[PDB]
Amino acid sequence: RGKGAYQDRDKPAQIRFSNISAAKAVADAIR
């Protein structure tokens, strides 16, 4: 058995990735 499962269907699924993408756009500005 899988010993349970945690369903996570909410805004963090997209926010945590958008925050990184914005930082990359600036981080490469001074490459």
Binding site: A22, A25, V26
Partner: protein, 49 residues
């Protein structure tokens, strides 16, 4: 996605090319007044001086 600055970002050959043209635009003026064979310029302002 893109840089979140509210202005415009131009890099590479875009600005490198524009920098030369801006310098040439000014040089295109003074080159005509070099040496004893040059001719005078007339400048007129907005109000008529």
């Amino acid at each position: 996605g893109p840089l979140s600055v509210f202005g415009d970002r131009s890099t590479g050959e875009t600005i490198r090319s524009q920098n030369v043209m801006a310098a040439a635009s000014i040089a295109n003026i003074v080159k005509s007044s070099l040496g004893p064979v040059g001719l005078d310029k007339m400048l007129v302002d907005d109000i008529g001086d």
